[PDB]
């Protein structure tokens, strides 16, 4: 029938990150800390070692470009690839970092000549290869901020793919999102890949901070390099949808009590339920899936303190 086991640890961090970007490489947890308060800006690659984040390398030090770039990190079996991309132009200019231990990185300046994602809003995320027809692909996906008429010629979500570990971005994945509603802002679009199945987790609101309703669309593969998505209704009355992940081919949905996240509720297959109530809140709670039956739920209850909830789940 079912199995739920939850243990939690803490992680101290002596680097005050503006934004955290967790990832699991070779079954271990790493962070992509952005340190930007003589303002030496850093894009540190930290790693969890016992109960502390250990800084391994600064990617911004080895970077020609300025400003907070777009960070796209891809975690395949035998390597990490992280891209730092200048936002503002006809061509995109990225810096491609490669590592296979988590500490050693070797950058290479890349140029996405005449990119399609121009005009589309991009944002930083961690992803994993998506296999389509005997070929894995890394995805840089963008959304159209505002829509006023239903143009078919122009698709709302656009994805450029790379089947050479991020070296050349010439493939175009066609995303067909049939529920794109008019007048409102759409932001923080990040794809969710699992079991070689594609989905997108984005926000729909009035402003990046004013209104932030979480949306989730699951896509099916219609034909060669073309996907067609539809919305997934995770709405629970008197609860705020926060993160969505999958364990055991079942959704793991995070909800808050209000938009202040004093308490979080985690639902498994909607069949089972647990409560996260930081003794501080659970704001910014995210699932960092480790395995098909194990995920992490991380939020920071203070500056420098991370709460690492480890969740084990299995259904039969």
């Amino acid at each position, epitope marked *: 029938h079912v199995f739920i086991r939850t243990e939690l640890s803490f992680i101290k961090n*002596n680097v005050p990150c503006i934004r955290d970007m967790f990832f699991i490489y070779k079954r271990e947890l790493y962070n992509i800390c952005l340190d930007d308060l003589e303002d030496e800006t850093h894009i540190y690659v930290q*790693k969890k*070692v*016992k109960d*502390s*984040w*250990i*800084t*391994l*390398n*600064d990617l911004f*030090k*080895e970077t020609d470009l300025t400003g907070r770039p777009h960070i796209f990190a891809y975690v395949d079996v035998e390597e990490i690839i992280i891209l730092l991309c200048e936002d503002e132009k006809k061509d995109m200019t990225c810096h491609r970092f490669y590592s296979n*231990d988590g*500490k*050693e990185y070797n950058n290479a300046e890349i140029t996405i000549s005449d990119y399609i994602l121009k005009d589309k809003l991009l944002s930083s995320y961690v992803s994993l290869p998506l296999k389509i027809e005997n070929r894995e692909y890394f995805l840089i996906c963008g959304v159209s901020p505002y829509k006023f008429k239903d143009d078919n010629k122009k698709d709302d979500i656009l994805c450029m793919a790379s089947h050479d570990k991020g070296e050349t971005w010439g493939t175009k994945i066609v995303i067909k999102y049939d529920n794109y509603k008019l007048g409102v802002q759409y932001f923080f679009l990040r794809p969710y890949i699992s079991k070689n199945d594609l989905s997108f987790h984005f926000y729909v609101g009035d402003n990046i901070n004013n209104v932030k309703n979480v949306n989730f669309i699951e896509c099916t593969h219609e034909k060669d390099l073309e996907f067609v998505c539809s919305n997934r209704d995770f709405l629970k009355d008197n609860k705020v949808l926060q993160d969505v992940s999958t364990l055991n081919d079942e959704y793991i949905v995070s909800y808050g009590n209000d938009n202040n996240f004093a308490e979080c509720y985690i639902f498994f297959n909607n069949e089972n339920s647990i409560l996260i109530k930081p003794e501080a809140g659970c704001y910014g709670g995210t699932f960092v899936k480790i395995d098909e039956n194990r995920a992490l739920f991380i939020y920071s209850s203070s500056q420098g303190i991370y709460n690492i909830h480890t969740i084990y789940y299995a259904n039969y």
Partner: antibody
């Protein structure tokens, strides 16, 4: 009184192995990246190896790669450099060193803030 | 490799400047009066100085260049100063600079 004391430096056999121990005091050992730096007689300073917090990462100099082995007994506050197949090129004075930043392992030699007294090794028959 | 000067010289009380052109990451300076004797950290992070080291020592990293400055040199300031940074492959040291006090 952040101090480091080296031991095991003597006249080892060419072909044999070496074992240098660096005991640290005054600072919270285990929270800082440790390193080994040698100096051949007459020649300048040379990086040997470095060990990250909790031994998570282990790096070596090209001169000693595939021969040296750095380890840490965080309880005893010691760093052991175990260099095998000793060539005459290994002769010199070895100084262990502490990185200034805690929970920080960026690959650089600009962050050393504590140097050990230095033990002399002689590879000779 | 880190390009460090072979030797530099100055009279007592005069300000001196030593450079390091090679390398990518931040720079550090360690003095060593005699070979075999342990070096002493003079500056660790680009413009950071240990509590035991006197106020006359200062750093500055302008591009790939870092200059160690000794304002008002003294007799106990004679040593072979070394440059510490990272080379293309891994962490690396400079060739060494020998400072001589003019008398």
């Amino acid at each position: 009184a952040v101090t480091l004391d080296e031991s095991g430096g003597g006249l080892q056999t060419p072909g044999g192995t070496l074992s240098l121990v660096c005991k640290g005091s005054g600072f919270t050992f285990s929270s800082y990246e440790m390193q080994w730096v040698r100096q051949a007689p007459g020649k300048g300073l040379e990086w040997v190896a470095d060990i990250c917090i909790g031994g998570s990462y282990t790096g070596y100099g090209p001169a000693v790669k595939g021969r040296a082995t750095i380890s840490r007994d965080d309880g005893q506050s010691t760093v052991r450099l175990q260099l095998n197949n000793l060539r005459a090129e290994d002769t010199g004075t070895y100084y262990c060193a502490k990185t200034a930043r805690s929970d920080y392992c960026i690959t650089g030699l600009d962050d050393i803030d504590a140097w050990g007294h230095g033990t002399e090794v002689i590879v000779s028959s | 490799a880190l390009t460090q000067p072979s030797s530099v010289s100055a009279n007592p009380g005069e300000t001196v400047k030593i450079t390091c052109s090679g390398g990518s990451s931040d720079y550090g300076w360690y003095q060593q009066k005699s070979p075999g004797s342990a070096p002493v950290t003079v500056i660790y992070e680009n413009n950071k100085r240990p509590s035991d080291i006197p106020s006359r020592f200062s750093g500055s990293k302008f591009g790939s260049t870092h200059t160690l400055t000794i304002t008002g040199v003294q007799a106990d300031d004679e040593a072979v100063y070394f440059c510490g940074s990272r080379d293309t492959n891994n962490g690396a040291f400079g060739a060494g600079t020998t400072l001589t006090v003019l008398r």
